[PDB]
């Protein structure tokens, strides 16, 4: 008889948080930004095309020096490119071909990748022996791992498919902080600019927020109808945009604890595969499954232009650490740098 | 050129990297991918062990070297995750190898898992990631089926069976028909085999089935199907 009281107490608390959040809402973001000028139609163009991959590209991640980038595809090879001169700085043959995520360390020395093997492998690039050799692999997950993020050079958060993000220690190979609390398979995660608290999205339309220091969940957001599979913080760290499987991105806020705007057109009916921000945050960038990316005005809620030029869907999207250019890696084995 | 002495060696390194990428791409174009998937305790472990003993946590990939051609059979059954999200990894596999056990009718939530394997089979082959692939279907445990059908009955657990109460041939061809007429609505050949615990050569069957798959794709390309 206690489980009935606990479930009804939980639903009462959900109602209390909902109507207390409703009284927290003064207005909407569409109401405030009616006094600012729009950006107008922008025309970003392809500057480089990076034809090195054979299978479909699943994930890319820029370098912190805004020049190199790592790409991962289903042929079983990470390749590290110099995006200025389009040369391939490195080619890393993987142990498992089914790689669904990759990440480049902000110290530059390390790289990591993972996928359907349930293992997160970590390679040491800058080596005295010449080749890119695997430093160590992190094996503590049961489902596939869907995202990797270096926070500094010795610890990495790995979202997985067992409704569990984690936090590892590469010097020992064991995890230190298991972030249990999701109910759907965790699809994406985004680290903060100050890098002390990350956000996570899963297969339950819920974008739960955590801190890396203690280990507790902080807040929990729910404004989506279907599966959310992309997430990205704001440039300061007080907001984050969310891209879900029903052609909707929406911007949640950390202190206001609500959504502020949502992004949808009627002809756009296919889900978002990746989302990212600019350095100023005026433009959201969303890579859909109608093969085109969109630059959304993050204040006036309309789209500031399209990006076409991929024959297949845009499975990964990334903006540099200084905002000079935009990489789109897609299923037609091509990356495209845009500005 | 206006490249440096250091920059030209970077372009030569990039071209050697290109050389190794193409020499690996036209090596991974050679072996044939087979998506094996089978649930409900269908004997997948002894199935793979049988194939590998007659032949010479995470996802597993098994190699095969028959008639100087090479297969990669990807087994994925150690996933506690949603298959709606990682199945687009196999948008062009050559064939889906299903494995259903013959005996798991009248095996029970309250539902018979033969109906659950029917639902899994339908929801896999109705995905849009499997147009150019075929469905190589396996039915395992023949002897357990014939013992269970000389012992028990089938007409009460499946009402649509109108056949002899001690029959095994018409029973297994009825449930093979039941698997076939899920109707992937584009008409396409679904190959089938009746294996057992001690079936020696079913690697020969999957060889002939992927051969007929590739040949059927070529014939429909040349309009002489």
């Amino acid at each position, epitope marked *: 008889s206690e489980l009935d009281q606990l479930r009804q107490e939980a639903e009462q608390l959900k109602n209390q948080i909902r109507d207390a959040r409703k009284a927290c809402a003064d207005a909407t973001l569409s109401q405030i930004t009616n006094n600012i000028d729009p950006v107008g139609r922008i025309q970003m163009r392809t500057r480089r095309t990076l034809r090195g991959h054979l299978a479909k590209i699943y994930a890319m991640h820029w370098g912190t020096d805004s020049r190199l980038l790592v790409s991962a595809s289903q042929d079983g090879k990470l390749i590290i490119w110099d995006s200025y001169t389009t040369n391939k*700085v490195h080619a890393i043959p993987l142990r498992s071909s089914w790689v669904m995520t990759c990440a480049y360390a902000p110290s530059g020395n390390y790289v990591a990748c993972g996928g359907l093997d349930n293992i997160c492998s970590i390679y040491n690039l800058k080596t005295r*022996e*010449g080749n890119v050799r695997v430093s160590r692999e992190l094996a503590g997950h049961t489902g596939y791992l869907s995202c990797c993020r270096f926070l500094d050079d010795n610890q990495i958060v790995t979202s997985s498919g067992d409704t569990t993000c984690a936090l590892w220690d590469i010097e020992t190979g064991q995890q230190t902080t298991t972030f249990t609390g999701h109910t759907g398979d965790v699809m994406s995660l985004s680290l903060a600019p100050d890098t002390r608290l990350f956000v996570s999205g899963a297969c339950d339309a819920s974008a739960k927020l955590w801190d890396v220091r203690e280990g507790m969940c902080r807040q929990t957001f729910t404004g989506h109808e279907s599966d959310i599979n992309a997430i990205c913080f704001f440039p300061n760290g007080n907001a984050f945009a969310t891209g879900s499987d029903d052609a909707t991105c929406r911007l949640f806020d950390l202190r206001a604890d609500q959504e502020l705007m949502t992004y949808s057109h009627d002809n756009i009916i296919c889900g978002i595969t990746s989302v990212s921000f600019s350095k100023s945050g005026r433009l959201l960038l969303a890579g859909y499954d109608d093969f085109n990316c969109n630059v959304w005005d993050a204040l006036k809620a309309d789209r500031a232009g399209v990006l076409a030029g991929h024959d297949n869907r845009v499975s990964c999207l990334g903006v540099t650490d200084d905002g000079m250019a935009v990489a789109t890696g897609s299923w037609d084995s091509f990356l495209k740098i845009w500005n | 050129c206006t490249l*440096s002495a250091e920059d030209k060696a970077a372009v*030569e390194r990039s071209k050697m990297i290109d050389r190794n990428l193409r020499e690996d791409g036209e090596k991974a174009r050679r072996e044939l991918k087979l998506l094996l998937l089978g649930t409900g305790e269908s004997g997948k472990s002894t199935f793979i062990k049988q194939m590998r003993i007659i032949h010479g946590t995470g996802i597993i990939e098994y190699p095969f070297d028959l008639e100087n051609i090479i297969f990669r059979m990807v087994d994925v059954g150690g996933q506690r995750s949603e298959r709606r999200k990682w199945i687009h990894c196999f948008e062009n596999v050559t064939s889906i190898m299903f494995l259903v056990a013959l005996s798991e009718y009248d095996q029970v939530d309250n539902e018979n898992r033969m109906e659950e394997s029917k639902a899994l089979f339908r929801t896999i082959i109705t995905y849009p990631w499997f147009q150019n692939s075929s469905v190589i279907l396996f039915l395992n445990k023949k002897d357990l089926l014939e013992d269970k059908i000389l012992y028990s009955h089938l007409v009460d657990y499946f009402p649509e069976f109108d056949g002899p109460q001690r029959d095994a041939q018409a029973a297994r061809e009825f449930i093979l028909k039941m698997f076939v007429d899920l109707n992937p609505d584009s008409d396409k050949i679904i190959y089938s085999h009746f294996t057992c615990a001690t079936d020696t050569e079913n690697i020969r069957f999957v060889f002939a089935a992927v051969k007929d798959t590739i040949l059927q794709l070529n014939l429909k390309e040349y309009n002489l199907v």
Partner: single-chain antibody
Amino acid sequence: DVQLVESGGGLVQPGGSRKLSCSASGFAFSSFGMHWVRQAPEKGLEWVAYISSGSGTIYYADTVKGRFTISRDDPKNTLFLQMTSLRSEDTAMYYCVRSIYYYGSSPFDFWGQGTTLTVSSGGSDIVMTQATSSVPVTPGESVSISCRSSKSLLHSNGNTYLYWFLQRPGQSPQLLIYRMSNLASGVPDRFSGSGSGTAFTLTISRLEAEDVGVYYCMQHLEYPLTFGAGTKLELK
């Protein structure tokens, strides 16, 4: 760890021929470009040959452009240099030095021990000069070594292709800094090189008795790769 050992020295007859072989043990040999340099037994060191990764591109110094030949063996993991028309200006100590070129690598990072070929009977390039040959300083003082070029080493991409090498007395040279700003992995962080166009200064702060030796500037803007004359830092 990394090992580069060469054989094929000694004493031979002038005018004849001689082969030379540095075997590499401890790294991925097929991915490294290789160089042969040589040092006159009382003068500084000069560059003689370079072979690329996979033997695609071969460059010779114009002194020995035609009577020298270079080759490698990536499975058997050796690097051969064969020398015909053996003069007495080829009297030197021969060093085998690996070098890899991607974005942000450290060429000339490891140098072999060297053989010695002792025998007896600078046109259309950048010459790297330095007009000081002995700076003896006590430990505990900032020492600035300079080196002058003929043309601006600053290329269009922004890099300045100046390399500094230390040589302790009695062993192989060591790469200190590369592209005149970036320190090698293994050197103490008291060295600091800087400059612009033609001004090129290596500054050592808080010196001790481990930084005593000869200092060589080196250019990489174009071929041939021409060294500097040297600068010795002694004790007191």
